[PDB]
Amino acid sequence: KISTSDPVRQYLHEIGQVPLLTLEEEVELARKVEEGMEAIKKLSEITGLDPDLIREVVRAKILGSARV
Amino acid sequence: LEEGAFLVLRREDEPVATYFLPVGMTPLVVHGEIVEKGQPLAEAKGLLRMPRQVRAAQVEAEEEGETVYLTLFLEWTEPKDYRVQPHMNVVVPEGARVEAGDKIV
């Protein structure tokens, strides 16, 4: 049906399911992200591989499966 | 204690005595030293139970007469709390020991 309200009840559903705990979860995830950032950089060091490369391999693994 | 009584006596300062009382012992605050006259006049009647949080293991006894002197292990757990802010991290799981140099949060 009319996609006015579709991607709204799309968005507000998982934002309904996850409207971030203003500090707690909000930062919880930010930290995790930086953790990834550096993990990735040191992995570049250990493997001799590209930072954005490792980045994308991770990304591909998480999303389940993708062309990317 | 909740259920128990620690009795210590520093003549001058050195901990001259350290004698504990299981519940069922009747204490008397500042008595005793008329001639050291075995006057921690604590009565032992019936059950002498233990504080449930602090544990009693390691037994020793030097046997003589009507009473034996006993020396044991006394490990009472002190409940002491802390409060986590938004920006605090809980590196430790759901119950584990920690060293003197083993940061927690």
Swiss-Prot record, chain B:
The RNAP catalytic core consists of 2 alpha, 1 beta, 1 beta' and 1 omega subunit. When a sigma factor is associated with the core the holoenzyme is formed, which can initiate transcription. DNA-dependent RNA polymerase catalyzes the transcription of DNA into RNA using the four ribonucleoside triphosphates as substrates. Belongs to the RNA polymerase beta' chain family. This is DNA-directed RNA polymerase subunit beta'.
